[PDB]
């Protein structure tokens, strides 16, 4: 669906924009809400007028790229599943690792 | 909230004082009950006097405040204290003035709760106080009109103080006639017409009427308030029983006729059906009103306005009675007589013939059955009269060539076409008598009676010619003289008319179908008046039923005729009744229920109950089936109670036909035929949509006779744009053919649905109400409960006369023309206090006249507010006239 | 899509049919040729008193003895008038006497239709002008009134009206205005016809009149002169 | 108070007891009769029931064979997709049978008691159609020459066929309504159809085209056939702008579905059978889109442009609109007409509308000349930019 | 007042009275409805049996038949049988049929589809009229079309003009085209249908004009009704690349709107609210007058006015007056109503995060800061001049 995106700012954004509209006003359940509509995207290009402005969305989140801390914290919980040999620093493996993801 | 406060001098603390008795007052509750008895009178006066001033001020102040839900229970608890020993026990001079704000405590309760049970209760308690006050009440209403501190609530509420009078527990003439009813009527159209109807305070109103008219004119709309009182009286039939009720209808008719506004008076008179009432209407209006106005002219016009049945001026019991009333009334003998005389309404019809033309397609197609069918069609296209005069004048082509039953029938129908001629219809009749078989000659006699009616007031009448005819031996010639005599007069209480019927009507069964019609005709003579009776009809009816009832058409007419003859009051009837009673049959039993209604002089509460313990949907062969269908329809009932109540009644009547149909397999086919006649009589709310909807289904379904009845009423609007609807309906009529028998019913249906341009449809009510009553329509209805039609049967159907006179615009005061009038258009409806609804103009221009048609032109109104006048006669043109009432002897309205 | 340059099956161009409509949008101007002179009348139709009524012009001079009233888009006409001023004096340099109503009108009309929306020079029109001009003056030949159209059809008239009332007014002129009606009567005829398209009654701040009469040059009528014709309409 | 309280509780209570009667008598499940027209309708259906019509399963005749059993034999295929070899009944008369048309067969013994009515294959098209309603000429704007021209084409031959035959000229079939919107192309089409008093079929261009390719061929084919069989049909093909477009293919879906309806209408019209008893009226805002086949005569005999009116015509739209209104006649109809020239029919009705908006705010029941003047100067300046006409008139 | 009350009591009585009188008395009578009528109903139950095959009535034909497609995946030609009325039934209803011989016994079923449920989204606004700051008049012109014929139709009919339907809400967006649509709906208290325009363009081909027809049907019955079509502009500009409908599908759907509005078939008292950011990208006929009567431009709310709306906002997200109310307002130069919400909504989030229930000055400054990344404040308008 990369073709939907460059075509006119997403067919997938179309679904998000409508759900966001429905959720903005609906029945007597405008007052209380426990159903959110969440978007994952990685571009700012796709963003139509309702998405772009704040006080229409509760938050726009910017993610911090994977750092040296993040590799450790993820590595540590992972390493438990297998057998390990004593005297291996979890700190050492993460720090060398340049990653690109978890 | 603050406790007490009518014990504190400032006008502001009065407003919490009203709420305060919910908790209780500090001094004010004890002052009135306990202290008044306990402590001496002289000492009390100090306490009371300071309290009186506040209590009075407070009354205008309470009205000024807007609560009715916080206001209402709080002042009501306080009311008990005053009643105990402040009513008239305190002293002699002080209570009378103290009762004046007391009245106020009760009024809010009277008003808020607008039911009839609260009205009653509220009245019993209020009337005793009134008598104690001895005229403090009239002054109280006066202050209210001014408004010291009031500004809203007092407009509904003050009317209620008047409402209190009705009970008359102790009130003789201490306020029952005039206590400012006239301001109270003028502002509030609602509550006063009810109070007015019951009290017969309405009598005083006649005296007032000149003064009241001034308010009526264009300052306020009083015209609406008068129109309202009639609505309540007709509805009051169901509320309170008919014997209690008859005196009430009679009382309102005297006041309505005297007061200038005639349309309300005619509705009540029509319901009563008596001899006395009709003469009076002319003379009363003249003497009370010193100025000529509309008032003199009304006596004539009311006759014209009234739509019962058949020939022009309608009932014509009134027209025969008018010949010396006309003389008393005097706005010019010569003029008044010429206009009143049917020559003037006939004359306008003639002028109309040229523009009108003929819009269907004629046929006088020589020889065969085709000839006989064709003769029928001629009358049918108009459904009355139009420019058929040219076709009919040639005798030779249609009439002479017709064979058998066809000659009688064609000849019979010929008078109904030629009605609305004074002479030149007559010449044609005289010729046909001379020529050919006995049949043309016999149908011609009936025809003479109708034509001659175009001039009367002892100006060449119907009676003179018909009397000689009555002797004739043949059963067909006899029928023609007697049927023509009931058709023409349509009400008579002249000696000569009654005596001629007396030794004839010796028939009780005959081969000829049309001979049964003689009974209807004798009953027809009775209508519109009290009893002298004619013995022969009464005797023959019971005898006929036992003897034959196999011919359904024949059978229907004889019991109906019996009830109609009885109608009215008198002791002449008492003598023949003894003779009738000695014989008792199961057969007589149904006829008797109709008589109860008749006897009383119009009923509607007695009628109502009887229609529940009904003869409806009942037979043993066709023994009880004689009156059963006629009863079920309850058309007479629907129209009788208000135009407003009619809407509902109509839906129920339809529902009722459906009910008779489920019950009997046979009744289903009849129930379909019954709908066209029902609709036609009734003047329904469901007017356009319904007959057409049925009509289409009936093409597809067998029985062509269904289309033929349905078509009488379905023709509806006459072409302005209605041509598209008529032509489409007509197309369906034409297309169908499969036999001659089949073809004859369709052929008639096609030509009836069509109408010549700017003629009119059917009407049986007066055109400012849905109340009416015909006897003319019972005849086609009876002969069209059969399967198919015959040449014989066809002749009765051809008549649908009770149609309009061609004036529906400016009856005027020195006009009486066909020529149009200024009208304005409003889509508006805001009223519910008018005789059939009429809106207020904004004075914006549209094409001349209200529609000459029997429907439409109802929200299209008169402009008489650049004339600065008020209409008596409400604008409609269903049958209505646009005339207005001024102090002036003539309306100075503009023409266009 | 289809172009606008194309001929329709009716047998006319689209751009031009629109331009006639543009003439219909504006204010009405009447130009009457009388043989006593040529009067041009135009409606000001002001809606505010803060305006200065002298500077609302819709009569502009082609020449010093030819006046012109213009109708439809006021702006679109102004360019044609700018080019006209240069030609009249130019005509004086070459001929050594002043330009005629006929000569000036045929030369502006050539420019009126030239339109080629794409692949046409920027020194030439992409679209025609929606203005109708009325050139009214008296010149060496005598009083002449020539009418020019946005379709570039020029014709000689004696009474012509253009603007919103153009068809209505033109019919109505043919009736009252003839050559058995004098110049002052032409001014009265124009004033009556003017009122339906106007939002208000006729006034001396709601008309502008100028007459060019024989032996005289172009005169713009002063407040007194406007007021004398207002008195009797 | 008491009397009314009592009557409310009582009446309601009576409906509960009555409940057995409510269902039989009024309807709303379990007998929906009043037994004046149903006594007849039921009666006729019963004889059918008893032998072999009901349950009548809809099927259609695929082919007429004479193989297996009797000489009359037909292969019908039911709408469950199984074929059956069936007989033919004289038990009740077959009346509408044609090869390929729907026919009815029984589930107990599969034989044709009665064929289904002519070409009811789309039930979908038939339901939406109005049949000749009455539209007054107090809302069909103007007097105008523009109105009159269409009528000669549409109304006169249907109203009277008499004339055309006598001379020996062929009668009108075709008219093209073309011009920008808001000129009441729809508005007039309706009015004259009732005036003529012939059957009115309006159909939307969008409804002809539906999901699958060749589904669009089924609805159009069967609509034209249905039209021909009935007595006098006018099919008013409503508003085809891109739902009528010229044949092309993009290889993703293409113009295929759109052209499908278009082409179907061409195949039955010209065909090897000509147009039957079918008159055609086209509404297009774009003739620029249409196929060369449609634009030539034999369904488009005369082209008439109903477009933006003339200067005199705009005054006539004011006069017709005023009749509907209950506003002053002291308001000059003409003044409004000059103040807004180059205005379509829709725009002149918005002026009246606007005039009313100013009027309600002020709290008047009647519109004024003041409100009116204001309404036209706002229309000439503002409304022009939005208006449909510059782009649609270029295509026209 | 008194005459009205008695009339109503009578009307109610007459339906009841008549129906009842004929029945019970005919049970006493020896020939009319009596036994038969009670039996007829019993007889429908026994004839139908169990089970009953369900159908949907597409149309009734006047020939003693109807087209009801049975739930078995084949079509049936039903006859008026088992005591039923042909004309009584209105199209589109689900009906019960006797399986044993095809007859419509009666009508009661609808068997509810999810498509109507999606359409009907009732109102309950965030903010609404009379809690919105400045430009009071701008709302009142809108009311002319939407609100005012619902509140009083009387004024319009009496005047005699075409009842105003259709409005275009245009201008640069930040004024609350969405807010105004919600606000009018609460005030009028009429049914609120909300369908977003993007939803018309579907992944299915040719469903779009069908979905319009249904929208308007659902509105007519509901009516007086308001329909808010949020953002009509979205379908024309965009090609989602979820369909092969193309430019053609948009064009057919836009057209179907016109037909349903006035057309050959009108839909009674359905007003349309079109929010749009632009008027030049829209289809020509859709924005032509006489499908709208009122055209209004929203310019952005004034810098003074931003202050009067803010007090209200701060109070809603707990009142503090320790805030620099003026600074937050100032930096942002004449732009969206949306930014005022963002600054309060965020600040309150931050306060909670800090672990308190009171929003303070520091929280207001912080939220503001986060909002400048997310939007661009009002720095665009500043750069130009």
Swiss-Prot record, chain A:
Highest taxon of source: Eukaryota
Subcellular location: Cytoplasm; Nucleus
Family (UniProt): Belongs to the AAA ATPase family.
Function: Component of the 26S proteasome, a multiprotein complex involved in the ATP-dependent degradation of ubiquitinated proteins. This complex plays a key role in the maintenance of protein homeostasis by removing misfolded or damaged proteins, which could impair cellular functions, and by removing proteins whose functions are no longer required. Therefore, the proteasome participates in numerous cellular processes, including cell cycle progression, apoptosis, or DNA damage repair.
Subunit structure: Component of the 19S proteasome regulatory particle complex. The 26S proteasome consists of a 20S core particle (CP) and two 19S regulatory subunits (RP). The regulatory particle is made of a lid composed of 9 subunits, a base containing 6 ATPases including PSMC5 and few additional components. Component of a complex with USP49 and RUVBL1. Interacts with PRPF19. Interacts with TRIM5. Interacts with NDC80. Interacts with PAAF1. Interacts, in vitro, with the thyroid hormone receptor (in a thyroid hormone T3-dependent manner) and with retinoid X receptor (RXR). Interacts with ERCC6.
Name of the protein: 26S proteasome regulatory subunit 8
Lineage of the species this protein comes from: Eukaryota, Metazoa, Chordata, Craniata, Vertebrata
Range covered out of full length: 255 to 356 of 406
UniProtKB/Swiss-Prot annotation, chain B:
Gene3D superfamilies, alphabetized: Leucine-rich Repeat Variant
Record has NADP as a keyword: no
Disulphide bridges, residue numbers: none
Chain positions found as Phosphothreonine: 9
InterPro entries, sorted: 26S_Psome_Rpn1, ARM-like, ARM-type_fold, Proteasome/cyclosome_rpt, RPN1_C, RPN1_N
N6-acetyllysine found at: 551
Region (Required for interaction with UBLCP1): 708-896
Bias (Polar residues): 10-20
GO BP: proteasome-mediated ubiquitin-dependent protein catabolic process; regulation of protein catabolic process
SUPFAM superfamilies: ARM repeat
Sites of N-acetylmethionine modification: 1
Biased composition (Basic and acidic residues): 24-51, 623-643
Modified sites of kind Phosphoserine: 29, 147, 361, 363
One Pfam family cited in the UniProt record for this chain: RPN1_RPN2_N
Region (Disordered): 1-51, 623-645
Molecular function per GO: enzyme regulator activity
Positions of post-translational Phosphotyrosine modification: 194
Subunit structure: Component of the 19S proteasome regulatory particle complex. The 26S proteasome consists of a 20S core particle (CP) and two 19S regulatory subunits (RP). The regulatory particle is made of a lid composed of 9 subunits, a base containing 6 ATPases and few additional components including PSMD2. Interacts with RPGRIP1L. Interacts with CRY1 in a KDM8-dependent manner.
Function: Component of the 26S proteasome, a multiprotein complex involved in the ATP-dependent degradation of ubiquitinated proteins. This complex plays a key role in the maintenance of protein homeostasis by removing misfolded or damaged proteins, which could impair cellular functions, and by removing proteins whose functions are no longer required. Therefore, the proteasome participates in numerous cellular processes, including cell cycle progression, apoptosis, or DNA damage repair.
Family: Belongs to the proteasome subunit S2 family.
Source species: Rattus norvegicus (Rat)
Gene transcribed to yield this protein: Psmd2
Curated annotation (Swiss-Prot), chain C:
InterPro entries: Ntn_hydrolases_N, Proteasome_alpha, Proteasome_alpha-type, Proteasome_alpha_type_5, Proteasome_asu_N, Proteasome_sua/b
CDD domains in the record: proteasome_alpha_type_5
Residues with PTM Phosphoserine: 8, 48, 55
Superkingdom: Eukaryota
Membrane-spanning intervals of the chain: none
Pfam families for the chain: Proteasome, Proteasome_A_N
Chain positions found as Phosphothreonine: 47
Localization: Cytoplasm; Nucleus
Glycosylation sites: 190
SUPFAM superfamilies, alphabetized: N-terminal nucleophile aminohydrolases (Ntn hydrolases)
GO annotation, cellular component aspect: cytoplasm; nucleus; proteasome complex; proteasome core complex; proteasome core complex, alpha-subunit complex
Record key words, sorted: Acetylation, Cytoplasm, Glycoprotein, Nucleus, Phosphoprotein, Proteasome
GO BP terms, alphabetized: proteasome-mediated ubiquitin-dependent protein catabolic process
PANTHER family linked: PROTEASOME SUBUNIT ALPHA/BETA (PTHR11599)
Family: Belongs to the peptidase T1A family.
Quaternary structure (record): The 26S proteasome consists of a 20S proteasome core and two 19S regulatory subunits. The 20S proteasome core is a barrel-shaped complex made of 28 subunits that are arranged in four stacked rings. The two outer rings are each formed by seven alpha subunits, and the two inner rings are formed by seven beta subunits. The proteolytic activity is exerted by three beta-subunits PSMB5, PSMB6 and PSMB7. PSMA5 interacts directly with the PSMG1-PSMG2 heterodimer which promotes 20S proteasome assembly.
Stated name of the protein: Proteasome subunit alpha type-5
Protein species of origin: Rattus norvegicus (Rat)
Swiss-Prot record, chain D:
Superkingdom in the source lineage: Eukaryota
Cellular compartments annotated: Cytoplasm
Record-listed ATP binding positions: 179-186
Ubl conjugation in keyword set: yes
UniProt PTM comment: Monoubiquitinated by RNF181. Phosphorylated. Dephosphorylated by UBLCP1 which impairs PSMC2 ATPase activity and disrupts 26S proteasome assembly.
One Pfam family recorded for the sequence: AAA
Record-linked InterPro entries: 26S_Proteasome_ATPase, AAA+_ATPase, AAA_lid_3, ATPase_AAA_core, ATPase_AAA_CS, NA-bd_OB-fold, P-loop_NTPase, PRS7-like_OB
A GO MF term: proteasome-activating activity
Any one Gene Ontology BP term: proteasome-mediated ubiquitin-dependent protein catabolic process
Keywords: Acetylation, ATP-binding, Cytoplasm, Nucleotide-binding, Phosphoprotein, Proteasome, Ubl conjugation
CDD domains found in the cross-reference section: RecA-like_PAN_like
Modified residues (N6-acetyllysine): 79, 385
Its biological purpose: Component of the 26S proteasome, a multiprotein complex involved in the ATP-dependent degradation of ubiquitinated proteins. This complex plays a key role in the maintenance of protein homeostasis by removing misfolded or damaged proteins, which could impair cellular functions, and by removing proteins whose functions are no longer required. Therefore, the proteasome participates in numerous cellular processes, including cell cycle progression, apoptosis, or DNA damage repair.
Sequence similarity: Belongs to the AAA ATPase family.
Protein name per its UniProtKB record: 26S proteasome regulatory subunit 7
Organism: Rattus norvegicus (Rat)
């Amino acid at each position: 669906g990369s073709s939907r995106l460059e075509g006119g700012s997403g067919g997938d954004s179309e679904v998000q924009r409508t759900m966001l509209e429905l959720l903005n006003q609906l029945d007597g359940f405008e007052a209380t809400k426990n159903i959110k509509v969440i978007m994952a995207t990685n571009r700012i290009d796709i963003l139509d007028s309702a998405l772009l402005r704040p006080g229409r969305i509760d938050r726009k989140i910017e993610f911090p790229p994977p750092n040296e801390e993040a590799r450790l914290d993820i590595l540590k919980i992972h390493s438990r599943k297998m057998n390990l040999t004593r005297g291996i620093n979890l700190r050492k493996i993460a720090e060398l690792m340049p990653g690109a993801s978890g | 909230m603050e406790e007490g406060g009518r014990d504190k001098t400032p006008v502001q603390s009065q407003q919490p004082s009203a709420t305060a008795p919910s908790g209780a007052d500090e001094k004010s509750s004890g002052k009135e009950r306990r202290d008044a008895g306990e402590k001496d009178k002289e000492q009390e006066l100090s306490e009371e006097d300071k309290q009186l001033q506040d209590e009075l001020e407070m009354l205008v102040e309470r009205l000024g405040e807007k609560d009715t839900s916080l206001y209402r229970p709080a002042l009501e608890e306080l009311r008990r204290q005053i009643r105990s020993s402040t009513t008239s026990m305190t002293s002699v001079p002080k209570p009378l003035k103290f009762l004046r704000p007391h009245y106020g405590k009760l009024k809010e309760i009277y008003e808020n709760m607008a039911p009839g049970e609260n009205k009653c209760f509220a009245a019993d308690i209020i009337s005793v106080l009134a008598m104690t006050m001895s005229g403090e009440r009239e002054c109280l209403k006066y202050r209210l009109v001014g408004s010291q501190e009031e500004l809203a609530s007092w407009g509904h509420e003050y009317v209620r103080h008047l409402a209190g009078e009705v009970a008359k527990e102790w009130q003789e003439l201490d306020d029952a006639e005039k206590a400012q009813r006239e301001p109270l009527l003028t502002l509030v159209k609602e509550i006063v017409p009810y109070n007015m109807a019951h009290n017969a305070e309405h009598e005083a109103c006649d005296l007032l009427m000149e003064i009241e008219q001034v308010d009526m004119l264009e300052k306020d709309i009083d015209e609406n308030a008068y129109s309202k009182v009639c609505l309540y009286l007709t509805s009051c039939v169901n509320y309170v029983p008919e014997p209690e009720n008859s005196a009430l209808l009679r009382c309102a008719l005297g006041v309505f006729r005297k007061f200038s506004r005639f349309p309300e008076a005619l509705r009540l008179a029509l319901m009563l059906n008596d001899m006395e009432l009709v003469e009076d209407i002319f003379t009363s209006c003249k003497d009370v009103v010193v100025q000529k106005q509309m008032a003199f002219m009304l006596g004539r016009h009311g006759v014209f306005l009234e739509l019962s049945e058949d020939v022009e001026e309608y009932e014509d019991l009134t027209e025969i009675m008018s010949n010396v009333q006309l003389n008393s009334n005097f706005l010019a003998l010569a003029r008044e007589l010429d206009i009143m005389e049917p020559k003037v309404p006939d004359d306008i019809y003639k002028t109309h013939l040229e523009n009108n033309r003929f819009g269907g397609s004629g046929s006088q197609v020589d020889s065969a059955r085709m000839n006989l069918a064709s003769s029928f069609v001629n009358g049918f296209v108009n459904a009355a009269f139009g420019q058929d005069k040219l076709l009919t004048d040639d005798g030779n082509k249609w009439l002479y060539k017709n064979k058998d039953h066809g000659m009688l029938s064609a000849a019979a129908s010929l008078g109904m076409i030629l009605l609305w001629d004074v002479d030149g219809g007559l010449t044609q009749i005289d010729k046909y008598l001379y020529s050919s078989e006995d049949y043309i000659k016999s149908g011609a006699l009936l025809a003479c009676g109708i034509v001659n009616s175009g001039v009367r007031n002892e100006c060449d009448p119907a009676l003179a010619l018909l009397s000689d005819y009555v002797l004739h031996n043949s059963n067909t010639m006899r029928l023609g003289s007697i049927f023509g005599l009931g058709l023409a007069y349509a009400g008579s209480n002249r000696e000569d008319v009654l005596t001629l019927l007396l030794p004839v009507m010796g028939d009780s069964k005959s081969s000829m179908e049309v001979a049964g019609v003689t009974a209807l005709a004798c009953g027809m003579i009775a209508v519109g008046s009290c009893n002298g009776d004619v013995t022969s009809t009464i005797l023959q009816t019971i005898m006929e039923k036992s003897e034959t009832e196999l011919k359904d058409t024949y059978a229907r007419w004889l019991p109906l005729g019996l009830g109609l003859n009885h109608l009215g009051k008198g002791e002449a009837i008492e003598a023949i009744l003894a003779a009738l009673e000695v014989v008792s049959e199961p057969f007589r039993s149904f006829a008797n229920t109709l008589v109860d209604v008749c006897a009383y002089a119009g009923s509607g509460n007695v009628l109502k109950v009887q229609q529940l313990l009904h003869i409806c949907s009942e037979h043993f062969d066709s023994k009880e089936k004689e009156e059963d269908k006629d009863k079920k329809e309850k058309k007479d009932k629907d129209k009788k109670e208000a135009p407003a109540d009619m809407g509902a009644h109509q839906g129920v009547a339809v529902l009722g036909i459906a009910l008779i149909a489920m019950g009997e397999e046979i009744g289903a086919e009849m129930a379909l035929r019954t709908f066209g006649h029902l609709l036609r009589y009734g003047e329904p709310t469901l007017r356009r949509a319904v007959p057409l909807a049925l009509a289409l289904i009936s093409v597809s379904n067998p029985r062509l006779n269904i289309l033929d009845t349905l078509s009488k009423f379905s023709h509806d609007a006459d072409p302005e744009v209605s041509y598209n609807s008529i032509f489409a309906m007509g197309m369906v009529g034409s297309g169908t053919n499969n036999a001659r028998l089949a073809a004859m019913l369709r052929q008639l249906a096609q030509y009836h649905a069509k109408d010549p341009n700017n003629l009119f449809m059917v009407r049986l009510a007066q055109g400012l109400t849905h109340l009416g009553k015909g006897t003319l329509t019972l005849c086609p209805y009876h002969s069209d409960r059969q399967l198919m039609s015959q040449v014989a049967v066809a002749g009765l159907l051809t008549v649908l006369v009770s149609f309009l006179d061609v004036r529906n615009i400016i009856l005027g005061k020195s006009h009486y023309v066909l020529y149009g009038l200024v009208a304005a258009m409003q889509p508006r409806m805001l009223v519910t206090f008018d005789e059939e609804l009429r809106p207020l103009p904004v004075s914006v221009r549209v094409g001349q006249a209200v529609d000459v048609v029997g429907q439409a032109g109802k929200p299209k109104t008169i402009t008489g507010f650049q004339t600065h006048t008020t209409p008596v006669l409400l604008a409609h043109g269903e049958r209505a006239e646009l005339a207005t009432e001024e102090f002036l002897p003539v309306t100075p309205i503009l023409e266009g | 899509d289809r172009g606008v340059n194309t001929f329709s099956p009716e047998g006319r161009l689209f751009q031009v049919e629109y331009a006639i409509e543009g003439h219909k949008l504006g204010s009405t101007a009447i130009g009457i040729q009388t043989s006593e002179g040529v009067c041009l009348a135009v409606e000001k139709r002001i809606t505010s008193p803060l305006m200065e009524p002298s500077s609302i012009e819709k009569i502009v001079e082609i020449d010093a003895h030819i006046g012109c009233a213009m109708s439809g888009l006021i702006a679109d006409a102004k360019t044609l008038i700018d080019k006209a001023r240069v030609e009249t004096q130019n005509h004086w340099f070459t001929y050594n006497e002043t330009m005629t109503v006929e000569s000036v009108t045929q030369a502006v009309s050539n420019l009126a239709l030239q339109f080629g929306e794409e692949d046409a020079d920027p020194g030439a029109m992409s679209r025609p002008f929606g203005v109708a001009l009325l050139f009214g003056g008296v010149d060496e030949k005598g009083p002449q009134l020539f009418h020019m159209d946005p379709s570039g059809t020029f014709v000689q008239c004696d009474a012509r009206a253009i603007g919103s009332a153009s068809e209505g007014a033109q019919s109505s002129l043919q009736e009252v205005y003839h050559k058995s009606t004098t110049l002052k009567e032409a001014i009265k005829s124009s004033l009556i016809i003017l009122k339906q398209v106007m939002e208000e009654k006729l006034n001396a701040t709601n008309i502008e009149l100028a007459t060019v009469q024989p032996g005289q040059n172009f005169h713009m009528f002063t407040k007194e002169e406007l007021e004398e014709v207002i008195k009797d309409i | 108070q008491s009397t009314y309280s009592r009557q409310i509780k009582q009446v309601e209570d009576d409906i509960q007891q009555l409940l057995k009667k409510i269902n039989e008598l009024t309807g709303i499940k379990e007998s929906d009769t009043g037994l004046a027209p149903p006594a007849l309708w039921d009666l006729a259906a019963d004889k059918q029931t008893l032998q072999s019509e009901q349950p009548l399963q809809v099927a259609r005749c695929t082919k007429i064979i004479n193989a297996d059993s009797e000489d009359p034999k037909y292969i019908i295929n039911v709408k469950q997709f199984a074929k059956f070899v069936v007989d033919l009944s004289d038990q009740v008369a077959p009346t509408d049978i044609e090869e390929g048309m729907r026919v009815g067969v029984d589930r107990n013994k599969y034989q044709i008691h009665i064929p289904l009515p002519p070409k009811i294959d789309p039930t979908v098209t038939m339901m939406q159609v109005e049949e000749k309603p009455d539209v007054t000429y107090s809302d069909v704007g103007g007097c105008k020459e523009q109105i009159e021209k269409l009528r000669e084409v549409v109304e006169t031959p249907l109203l009277h066929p008499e004339r055309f035959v006598n001379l020996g000229i062929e009668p009108p079939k075709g008219v093209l309504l073309f011009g920008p919107p808001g000129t009441g192309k729809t508005l007039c089409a309706r009015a004259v159809a009732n005036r003529t008093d012939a059957c009115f079929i309006p159909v939307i261009g969008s409804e002809l085209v539906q999901k699958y390719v060749g589904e669009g061929a089924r609805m159009v084919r069967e609509l034209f056939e249905m039209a021909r069989t009935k007595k006098a049909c006018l099919i008013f093909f409503d508003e085809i702008d891109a739902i009528g477009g010229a044949r092309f293919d993009d290889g993703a879906g293409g113009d295929n579905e759109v052209q499908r309806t278009m082409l179907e209408l061409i195949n039955q019209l010209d065909g090897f059978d000509p147009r039957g008893n079918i008159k055609v009226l086209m509404a297009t805002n774009r003739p620029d889109t249409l196929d060369p086949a449609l634009m030539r005569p034999g369904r488009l005999d005369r082209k008439i442009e109903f477009s933006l009116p003339d200067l005199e015509g705009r005054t006539h739209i004011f006069k017709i609109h005023a009749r509907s209104m209950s506003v002053e006649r002291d308001i000059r109809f003409e003044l409004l007409a000059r103040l807004c020239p180059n205005s379509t029919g829709a725009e002149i009705r918005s002026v009246c509308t606007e005039a009313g908006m100013f009027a309600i705010r002020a709290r008047r029941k009647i519109a004024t000349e003041k409100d009116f003047l204001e309404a036209v100067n706002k229309v000439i300046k503002s409304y022009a930019k939005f208006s449909a006409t510059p782009r649609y008139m270029t295509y026209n | 007042t008194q005459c009205r009350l008695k009339l109503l009591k009578l009307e109610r009585i007459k339906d009841y009275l008549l129906m009842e009188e004929e029945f019970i008395r005919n049970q006493e009578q020896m020939k009319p409805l009596e036994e038969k009528q009670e039996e007829e109903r019993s007889k429908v139950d026994d004839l139908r049996g169990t089970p009953m095959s369900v159908g949907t009535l597409e149309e009734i034909i006047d020939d003693n038949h109807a087209i009801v497609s049975t739930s078995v995946g084949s079509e049936h030609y039903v006859s008026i049988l088992s005591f039923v009325d042909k004309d009584l039934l209105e199209p589109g209803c689900s009906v019960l049929l006797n399986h044993k011989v095809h007859a419509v016994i009666g009508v009661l079923m609808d068997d509810t589809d999810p498509l109507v449920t999606v359409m009907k989204v009732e109102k309950a606004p965030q903010e609404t009229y009379a809690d919105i700051g400045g430009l009071d008049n701008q709302i009142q012109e809108i009311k002319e079309s939407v609100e005012l014929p619902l509140t009083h139709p009387e004024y319009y009919e009496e005047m005699g003009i075409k009842p105003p339907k259709g409005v275009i809400l245009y201008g640069p967006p930040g004024t609350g085209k969405t807010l105004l649509a919600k606000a009018v709906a609460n005030q009028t208290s009429a049914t609120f249908l909300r369908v977003v325009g993007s939803e018309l363009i579907q992944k299915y081909l040719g469903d779009g004009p069908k979905l319009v027809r249904e929208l308007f049907r659902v509105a007519e019955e509901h009516a007086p009704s308001i329909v808010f079509i949020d953002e009509i502009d979205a379908i024309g500009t965009k090609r989602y690349d979820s369909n092969s409908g193309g430019e053609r599908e948009i064009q057919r759907t836009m057209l179907e709107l016109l037909n349903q509005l006035d057309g050959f078939d009108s839909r009674g008292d359905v007003k349309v609210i079109m929010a749009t950011n632009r008027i030049e990208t829209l289809d020509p006929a859709l924005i032509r007058p006489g499908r709208i009567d009122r055209k209004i431009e929203f310019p952005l709310p004034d810098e003074k006015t931003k202050k009067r709306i803010f007090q209200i906002h701060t109070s809603r997200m707990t009142l503090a007056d320790d805030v620099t109310l003026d600074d937050l307002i100032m930096a942002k130069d004449d732009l969206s109503g949306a930014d005022i919400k963002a600054i309060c909504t965020e600040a309150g989030l931050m306060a909670l995060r800090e672990r308190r229930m009171k929003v303070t000055n520091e929280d207001f400054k912080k939220s503001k800061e986060n909002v400048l990344y997310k939007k661009q404040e009002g720095t665009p308008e500043g750069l130009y001049l």
